[PDB]
Amino acid sequence: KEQRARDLADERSNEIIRKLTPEQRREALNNGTLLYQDDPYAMEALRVKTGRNAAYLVDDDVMQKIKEGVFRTREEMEEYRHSRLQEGAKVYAEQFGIDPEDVDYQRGFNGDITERNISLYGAHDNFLSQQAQKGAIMNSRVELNGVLQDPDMLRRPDSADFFEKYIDNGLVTGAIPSDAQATQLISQAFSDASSRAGGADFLMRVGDKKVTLNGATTTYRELIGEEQWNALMVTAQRSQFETDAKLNEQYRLKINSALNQEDPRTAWEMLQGIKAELDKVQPDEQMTPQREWLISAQEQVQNQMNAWTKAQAKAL
Amino acid sequence: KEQRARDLADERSNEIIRKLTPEQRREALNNGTLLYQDDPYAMEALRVKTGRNAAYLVDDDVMQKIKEGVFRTREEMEEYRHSRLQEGAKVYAEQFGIDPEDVDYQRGFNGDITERNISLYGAHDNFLSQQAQKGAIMNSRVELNGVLQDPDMLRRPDSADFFEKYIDNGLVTGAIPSDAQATQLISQAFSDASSRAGGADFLMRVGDKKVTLNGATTTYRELIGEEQWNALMVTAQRSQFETDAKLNEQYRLKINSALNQEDPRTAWEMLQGIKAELDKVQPDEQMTPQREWLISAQEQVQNQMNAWTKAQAKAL
Amino acid sequence: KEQRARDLADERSNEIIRKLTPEQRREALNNGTLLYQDDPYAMEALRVKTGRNAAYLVDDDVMQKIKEGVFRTREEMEEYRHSRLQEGAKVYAEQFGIDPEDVDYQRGFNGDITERNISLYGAHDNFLSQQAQKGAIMNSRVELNGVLQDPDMLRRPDSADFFEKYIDNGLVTGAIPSDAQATQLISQAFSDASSRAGGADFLMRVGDKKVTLNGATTTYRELIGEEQWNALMVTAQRSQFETDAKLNEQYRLKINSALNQEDPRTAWEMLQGIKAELDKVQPDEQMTPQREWLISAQEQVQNQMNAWTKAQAKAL
Amino acid sequence: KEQRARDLADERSNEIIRKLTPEQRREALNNGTLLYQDDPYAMEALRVKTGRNAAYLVDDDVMQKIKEGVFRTREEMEEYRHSRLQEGAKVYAEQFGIDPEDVDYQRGFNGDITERNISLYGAHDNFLSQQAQKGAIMNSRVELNGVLQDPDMLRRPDSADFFEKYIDNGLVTGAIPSDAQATQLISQAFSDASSRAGGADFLMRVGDKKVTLNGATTTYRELIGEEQWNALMVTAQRSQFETDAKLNEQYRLKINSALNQEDPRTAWEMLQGIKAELDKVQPDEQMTPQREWLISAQEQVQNQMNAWTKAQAKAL
Amino acid sequence: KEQRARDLADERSNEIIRKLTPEQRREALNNGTLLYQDDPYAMEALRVKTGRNAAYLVDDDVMQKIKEGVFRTREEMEEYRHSRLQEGAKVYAEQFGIDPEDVDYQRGFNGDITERNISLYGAHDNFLSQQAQKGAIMNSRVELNGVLQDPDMLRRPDSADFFEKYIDNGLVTGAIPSDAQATQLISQAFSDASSRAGGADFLMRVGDKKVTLNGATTTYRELIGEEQWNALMVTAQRSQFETDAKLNEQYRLKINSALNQEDPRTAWEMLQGIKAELDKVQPDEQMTPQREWLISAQEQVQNQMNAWTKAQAKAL
Amino acid sequence: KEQRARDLADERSNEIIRKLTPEQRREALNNGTLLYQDDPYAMEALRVKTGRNAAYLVDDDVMQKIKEGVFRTREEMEEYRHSRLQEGAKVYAEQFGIDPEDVDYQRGFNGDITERNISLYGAHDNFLSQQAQKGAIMNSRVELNGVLQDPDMLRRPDSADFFEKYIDNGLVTGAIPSDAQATQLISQAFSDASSRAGGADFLMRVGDKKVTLNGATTTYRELIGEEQWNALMVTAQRSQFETDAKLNEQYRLKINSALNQEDPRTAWEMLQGIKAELDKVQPDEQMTPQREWLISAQEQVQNQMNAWTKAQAKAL
Incomplete structure (x- = not known):
């Protein structure tokens, strides 16, 4: 009849955890006045359940601070995870009046641990990839603005050569990994050199180099559409007269x-x-x-x- | 044959709960004129089902008031949850003519309690994180508008220093946690200082400090795009002539x-x-x-x- | 061999329900000319299936009239649900030539009743919450338009005080529950007082009160962005000259x-x-x-x- | 060993249905040259599988013609479903060289029939509700354009009364069921009377009646926003000068x-x-x-x- | 102990398929130097797994060429499916060094064949319905441009009659099946006749015929909104002066x-x-x-x- | 009692993997001071779990670098997958202090290998199809810009013939596979020839050829809408005066x-x-x-x- 005694234990546990607050239960646990303190299986089910609760609370805290970026590296998230696991197990066991060592509480609090760690690692790795993408985009603009911000260095006939060499290298070596993001990098560097002094020369000179993107090889003037190129050139030629x-x-x-x-x-x-x-x-x-x-x-x-x-x- | 007698009990329970309203059943329960009052398993199944109903009703009420923000803190939501659980169990048992103590009713009303509490805690924590994000965004504007609202204090050569120090501190200490939200904070503070008197000086002075965002380190003028910077500067210089x-x-x-x-x-x-x-x-x-x-x-x-x-x- | 005889019954039931229309089956049921009228398990499976059909038909009717709002209160939806359950059971049993009382038909028509009631209650409660939100938004505009429609009562120096007191009370007591919706209410009341006579005075006076929203406490002029405030003020000052x-x-x-x-x-x-x-x-x-x-x-x-x-x- | 002989039958069936086309199998079925013609369980599995195929083909045809609206009423869809079921069973059995009567073929072709009928009824009922919504919207415009198209009948002081009475009745009786769609109906009737002769009088007269929508009761001028009302009035007054x-x-x-x-x-x-x-x-x-x-x-x-x-x- | 020996076989298979490339395994299979060549169950599990791989590869190839339209009819997709199944089974078995006939390899490569065929048929039928929709839209424009392209035939008083008769027939017979798409067809034919010579006469004459759409019956001028009609007429009257x-x-x-x-x-x-x-x-x-x-x-x-x-x- | 001893082993494993960091466990594994070093089943469960962790880590790394395009061909992704599998198994086993050979660790690290390979192949094949689509689009512009960039070769009366022949061939042979993408190719080639010298002649000459798309056959001027054609022609005639x-x-x-x-x-x-x-x-x-x-x-x-x-x- 072991299948029934434990079955009634689940019902008694559910009644205990519904009919009381996280406070009254602690006040009544040391007074020996719970509803099913006598039955051991009832208390065991109540403990194994009140642990799966705290586990989800601490996991939700960590996952919620992961979703919106608060952990930059990976080691910092793991460290915060570990510290919060320990401290939260202790504090939730103390609040719910349960011994933070009794094996049954841990069978619930540690119930499905590897899968929850998998979930957190996946979400945080998604966010880390996103911020690494954004950081590559934002970083390959400063590196260009070292030799493309000077309105005098720009119009030299070698700036186009440097830009083409940079895209080619960073696309072959790995500095600019995502072939799909090379479009964003190119468009951003252009729009930068578009609305800045002397940019017209740089654009009209770079518009005839060679860049490989997505298998096919074309010329920059042909990568972005011809009408887009004409609009970009018009903007780059109105720049000097709308900036100085x-x-x-x-x-x-x-x-x-x-x-x-x-x-x-x-x-x-x-x-x-x-x-x-x-x-x-x-x-x-x-x-x-x-x-x-x-x-x-x-x-x-x-x-x-x-x-x-x-x-x-x-x-x- | 216990597998069949209970199997017929489920069918009789379903017929009872379909063929009657929540009112007629109470009127007929005390008159001893239900369709299967004689069979005890039928009444037991009807009770264990009519509890899972009220459980879902009270849970849907609480979850619906959680979805659209009516609970600001976490303790208030838990308090409302507990009060509604108690009162709803009592009132739904009374309406459906069932004893609010009979163990079978609670086996349904308390059926899956920890998982429903997990669901509510997750949804409410999602909303709480969202409002904390919005509150950080709205709060770090008042703190700036303490020393950036005065059109005379703004154009002093130290306002840019204060702004850079504030972003740096709030990004290192934790006052501005989300590196992703620092972009929103920066853009909002700019658009504020953009369309306000003297803002041109503050922008042209802050456009050469150092701010770290997403791993790479750049200058504010290079964080937002150069054409975006030119548009923002044009707006900040037309401000004084479109406000006073x-x-x-x-x-x-x-x-x-x-x-x-x-x-x-x-x-x-x-x-x-x-x-x-x-x-x-x-x-x-x-x-x-x-x-x-x-x-x-x-x-x-x-x-x-x-x-x-x-x-x-x-x-x- | 009970596992096989019923297994063949399912196949015979499927053949019966595919090879005939809801009309021919009735014409052939009283003529004793179905394909497996002799086998009792075949007829039993056909009945328990032809009930789960009508159950889904009536549930789909009710859910479809719930999705797009036709039931305002909750009691009206429950009443329509009950009446349609009864009438539909009767009429579909009559159309399919089945006795609306034979226990097997009800085992299918009442198969999963509590879960379907849960689904309907959830969908209708979602819609009811949505319309209550929209109704609060639309109602707190009439209450304001009682002392904000008069172009003479508006520009008095106490209208801003009344507006601030109203938002504060309705945010503390519960008249305006959703802190997230207080933004919509504020923006709507403003856009109202924006494009109406004398609104400039009311806006310029209310722009320095105190309103709490999402934890942080700010001033109305700082709640909505400063550039948004300037645009709103320009509109509120062009109102009188584009309305009269x-x-x-x-x-x-x-x-x-x-x-x-x-x-x-x-x-x-x-x-x-x-x-x-x-x-x-x-x-x-x-x-x-x-x-x-x-x-x-x-x-x-x-x-x-x-x-x-x-x-x-x-x-x- | 019945668990193994049938297990090998599934593998042989899969090999048969992969290694041949729907044509070669018919040519080789009457020549007695299939790969496992000898084993009866292999042929049985091949038949029960080649039926579940045709069932999905005919169901996909019907569901695909249902998704994009080709069936207006409900009886027409059921009729087409039945005719296609019969004809498709026959023709696919004939093409795959299988007897359209052998019980095993039907155990697959009729495998899960009630659930597929449920799916089709649900999708078609969704589409029918959508077209009934669109038809109510399009119909309550012709009924209005019977006494609102005449540029002389419109400006009479009773047209506003007729419009208010129509919305009130159709909202209480049921002619305009969806309280949410009453907004679309109102806006459409307005935009109609907006850009038509004399519409200014009709709008300025109807802007002070009473209409109930979403629990709260307001005035038409207050239902749509005040700035929206001013824009609508400007359009309704420019109409006569941009139409005649x-x-x-x-x-x-x-x-x-x-x-x-x-x-x-x-x-x-x-x-x-x-x-x-x-x-x-x-x-x-x-x-x-x-x-x-x-x-x-x-x-x-x-x-x-x-x-x-x-x-x-x-x-x- | 058959439950354990096969259980260890799965682990050995997983180790084999992880620790080696699709090339080294072939080089080591004929040299008799795999990690578990001795155990027959290990090799059997490795074969039944290395087949489910190739099955998914060929299915992904076919599904990927189906998603973006490369198969117009249905017979062409089935033909390509069959040819690729055969050739891919052979070539992947040859590459992975496995006999393309050994029964165990086929138990994996043919594992779930009917369901994968169902998936492919569903996706390709979705695409085929989409292209048939687009083709009906594009085709019923050429048929109209046979007697609506001539700027002289258009303004005859019978063109409106032909257009109304065409919509009525194609909506009753089946040439224009989707009542929902009749709106797109009507709007496209109008916008065509809008920006073309003489179109004003055709529009002003067709604006009083009868067309049925979505249950309710209205007039073309009332199908599209009155303000939309005025804009369309203005465009149709500016056409002749912006085209010739x-x-x-x-x-x-x-x-x-x-x-x-x-x-x-x-x-x-x-x-x-x-x-x-x-x-x-x-x-x-x-x-x-x-x-x-x-x-x-x-x-x-x-x-x-x-x-x-x-x-x-x-x-x- | 084998069902219980292993059941307790899972709990002990979960406690071990929660109560310690990936560092402390290595320091304490060689000191013989874990919490359940004595029990062999506990250590076995800890090992089979700490492998499923590293498997997910390496799989997440590879899948994350696949999602955003870093692998162009298919062989490169497979090569990186294999190298990372080997190196990651070794390094994670070394970090977690586990022998990278002990069979239990591999039962977790190789747990579900074929399905994870299926997932990676599917995602990478999706990305590869996307980049092949983009590459066909970008490539069939360079091939056209070989005989359509010269402002003198364009206006010859044979350029339209070459363009029509190219679309026809690439649509029949397979150079332009996707009939759905032929629209993008056509629109891109037009917008190119639109805003370039002499383009007016090329457009006015090509507007009367024959192109098949989606079953129905039409003329280019009728493929894109007539108003779209007029706008495109206006742009193509303003090109020469907005470019030179x-x-x-x-x-x-x-x-x-x-x-x-x-x-x-x-x-x-x-x-x-x-x-x-x-x-x-x-x-x-x-x-x-x-x-x-x-x-x-x-x-x-x-x-x-x-x-x-x-x-x-x-x-x-």
Whole structure:
């Protein structure tokens, strides 16, 4: 009848653990006034259950602090796990009035230990891989910003060579492991060099190197779509004029001074000089809001030249 | 044949619990007119089932009030759980006409108690972690707004030092636990200091400190993307002119007064003084809608100077 | 061999229930021409199966009308459940030609009854919690619109006090249970008071009270982000000028009349009076499309004053 | 050893069903050249397996035509199910060279029949509920468009009463069952009456009735947010001027004719008459792109009156 | 002890399959130097396991080429499945050094064959249904573009009749099976006829037919929302002027020529003729960017007529 | 009693593995001071468990480096798997102080090996299929950019033929396997040829070929929607004027020079020549921002001709 006596023990344990709080049970355990203190199987089931509770509490605490990143390395999470296991076993046994040594309590508190450790290791390893991915992305930007932040070092004809060599090495050696993440790294380095001085030269020079990604081998200008390339180039050429306000003032004032000369024939030469100087800070031939400035200036200077030639007949 | 008599008991219990409402059964239990009142196993199965029902009802009530946050601490949820367990056992037993003490009713009402407590503790701990995350985010904004709300204390050269020290400490000690959430905290503090007076100085000064995030160590200007940094700086420099309307009026009226002098030579000096004063409320060199005001003013004053010099020849 | 005879009964039942429609079986049951009418175990399996079918049909009907909200309270869903159980058992037994009393049919139709009731109670309680949430959100707007709809009662200096007291009470007592939903309630009440007359005063006064949310305690202006606060204030100050068209006409016509006086010196006083009156319907100092009206008016009146002073020399 | 002989039968069946196509097996079944034709248990396992295949094929066909809606009612799906069951059993048995009557084939083809019928009924009932929801939404728009499409019947003071009575009845009786869907119905009827002639009157009149939704009772203007109400009213007042181009022409030409009179004093009266007539096609006081037309007209007529009064002094 | 000897065989098999590569095992199988070559149960377990591996490899290959569509019909997928099964069994047995005939290898390679075939048939049938849906959508556009692409056949008064008859037939017969997809077909055919010449007539004529969808029966203008209908009509009337640039030139030049006549009285007649001709290429009364052209033209011609009448007094 | 002695062994193993760290256990294993060193079953359970741990650690490492792509081919992943299995077994056994040969440790470390290999092969094959898809997409762009990048080779009348032949072949042979991905390939090749010089001719010529996709056969202009086709054509015709700024300058300056001649009669001929030349770089008749330039030019030249004809009467 051992199958029945233990079966009734489970019911008595459930009644004990429902009808009382974690406090009243301790107050009544030393007073010998529980509902089934006499039956030993009832107390045994109550102990083996009140341990599986504390095990889940400490595991939930650790898993919850793992989910949102509070453990960076792996050894720190294991250390916190061990310390919390020990301290929590002790403190929950003390709170529930149970001896933290009685074998039955541990059969529940240690019930399924390897599988719970597997679960925690899996979740924390997922988070660690995620932060290592994010850290590679954030790190390979500082390494580039060592020789790509200087607006003078950028436009040298070797910066494209350094960038291509860096992607090639970090893709072959292992510095940039994920071939899928090389796209994010490339796009981030571009958007950086896009909205920074002189970036137009660097982009127009790097747009013809060779980079391997996902089996097929192509050219950078062909990796990202052609329309995406045109938009990126337009942004990289508007950068210098939306980042260094002084240059905007200089070119607008010089366009105005050229447009406002008395003899338009010299205004043509001044506008031509302005465009010749502006081609050296916007090499690629895309249309930017500045070529439109030159368009309006040439429009107005041509109208002025027409008017001045028509009014020159009155000098006859 | 014990395997069959109890098997028929389950069928009779199911017929009893389907063919009647929670009201008619009470009216008919004291009248001795149930469908299988004679068979004891039928009544036993009906009782052990009508308890697993009330258990799920009270558990669903508590879990439903846990899902959407009504319990802030953990002790309050446990207290409500215990009170509802007791009161619900009593009231559902009374409604279904069953004795709230008969052992069979409790074998169902207490059937799987530790696992249901595990489920509730897990859900409520998930919610508690979420609200603690949100509370850390909302709290580390008030602590910053103690020495970053004053538009005069902000532009001092030590505010950047205090901000860097705060992030470093709260990231090393534990005040800001989640390395992943430090990004949200940083972005929120920036967007705060972005659209507030004097914020341009604070941003341009903090953009060169050191902050560690996700293993790699970088500079704040390099943490968020360079184009994101330029957009943030443009917003932080348009802030003062989209928050204190009086300053907008002052600069627009002074630009107009400068532009409308009779001798443009003094208008050049007035516009230069305006730009010199404006550089002290917009330090970084990004292009804002105000440098465009100065551009238009210089354009028009140069046109006026050209016209006045051309009409000066008539004084000969 | 009882394990085999019943095993063949299941196969015969499956063949019966596949090879016939719910109609032909009734026509052939009273004609004694089924495929295995002779074997009693075959008919028993066919009955215990054709009941589990109708049980699922009625349960699917009830669950489907529960999923999309057709039952508001809980007692109404239970009542509909009971009536549909009875009527559906009867009608499906009648359609399938089976006696609605034969014990075997009920062993299938009542097979797993408590678990299906658990499922329905869970789904309907989920929906009931959702509608109670939505109803609290929609209800705490009418209670506010009792003393916040009057454009005159709003701008009194006590409306902010009433709003703060209401949130505090409803957050402590229980009228507004979900601390997470207090954000939705606050944002909704604001957006209401935002786009309504006089709302600027109410917002600028409430932006310095104290509200507790998620453990940390802050000020309303700091709960929602500072840039969000500036946008909300701009909207609340453009409200009065995008809701009462008459006021727009009044201020635009008065600005025009001021700008079009013959002696600009009085136009300065008129514009100053206009701005002084306008500060009382837009207290906070944010930039709105109306301060821009005053900016353009002052620009043009200053140009006119300059022109009139320059042409005053001809009076000498 | 019956546990082993059948165990080897499963392996032989798997080898038979892998090593051959549905065609070669038929060609080789009548030639007596299968791999294990001698063993009867092998053939029995092959038959009981080759039936569970065809069962899944026909079930997948029916479930796939159910998923994307091809069965509107429920009886049509059941009819197609039955016809396909019969025809598919026959045709798949014929293709696989198996007798469509041999009991073993049916033990597999009819293996789990009630559960598969449960699955199909559940999926098809889900789809039927979805289309009934969509049909209620689409139907309660035609019923409204019977007395809300006429641009003359709409602006009568009883249309709001009819709309409120309709929502109240259909929400109490059952014509509009889902309290959650009443929001969609209300918003759809509004957006209809929004962008249609005279809709402004209907909206401004219905915005003060009583509608119950989700326990709490409010007013229509308070059901949808106040800013949403202002946007909806602006759209409903721009409707008439973005739907009947003739009226746009009429008002623009009349504004121009008023603005272009020789004596502005009569132009004031003409513009006042225009605004008085326009208030009857835009009752609520929200700002629309048309009040802005009147604003510009009054601006220009005031400038013209000022100029004409200033030039009247030359008549002295 | 048969339960233990085989139990140790599983462990030895696992050690064999972990401690070696798919290459070393073949090199060591013919050299008689495996770790447990002596024990027959070890080799048997190793064989029954190394088959379940190859089975999963070939199944994963086929399922992976099924997931992303490479098999259009069903017979092609079955053919590829069979060929790959045979060839893969042979080649994997050869690579792993196992006889491709030994019964134990097949007990693993053919282990669960019917269920894997069920899985593949289900996935491929899902994809086939998806492509049949997409193909019906793409096909019922070519059939319409046979009598709806001609800009002259479209505006005939029977095109609406053909479209309504087509939807009705294809919805009753079965050419357009999914009542849910009839919405996509209708919207696609509209958007086609929207941005194409003469489409305005076709839309304004079809907007009053009858189409049944989801139980309820409505009119096309009421199927899609009224505001959606107005937007669609505006697009369909701007189509002709955003697709055939020549017509844009013609109307703009003629508007200019009318506006620039010397006597405005004839300009009124010219503009009236232009509007009368334009009503035949934009029947419905919605406001388009072209009625605005006529509005500006009438505005300017009325101003010119006023000026010319005022200057006519000087002819007295 | 063998069922109990091993049952206690599991509890003792769990206590051992909870109460100690991976370090203390090694220090105490050689000192003979574990908690249950005496019992052999306890040590056996501890060993069989401490192996299932290391197995999961190495499997999680490999699966985590597989999830985010670090293994391109399949043989490389298998090689890394094998090397890590060996090295990890050895190193984890050494760290946990267990003999890396004792049979019990391997019964846990090799516990479920074939299923874990199945899981890894499945995940890595999913990733490999994804990268092969992306590689086909990226590769069939370089192959096209060999004869579609030259702005002169593109506008030849055979480029459309080559493109159609390429899609047809790669869809029949297998170079472009996924019929679903042919849409992505087509759209990408178009968007490439869209925003590149001369692309208008290529698009307007390819828009009438034949391509089969998803059973139904249509024309390219009908594959993508007609409104999508019009938008794509507008973009392809604005490309040349938003990519080669020199051409923008040329046409704007020539339009200005034509508009500014003294005798408008020659300006008509100049504008007509400009439009005739512009039709050869924008063949399709869609409306672009350039036809609007010609519209404004013709508008202004017609106004000028009217003014000059009206002022010609003064020459009489």
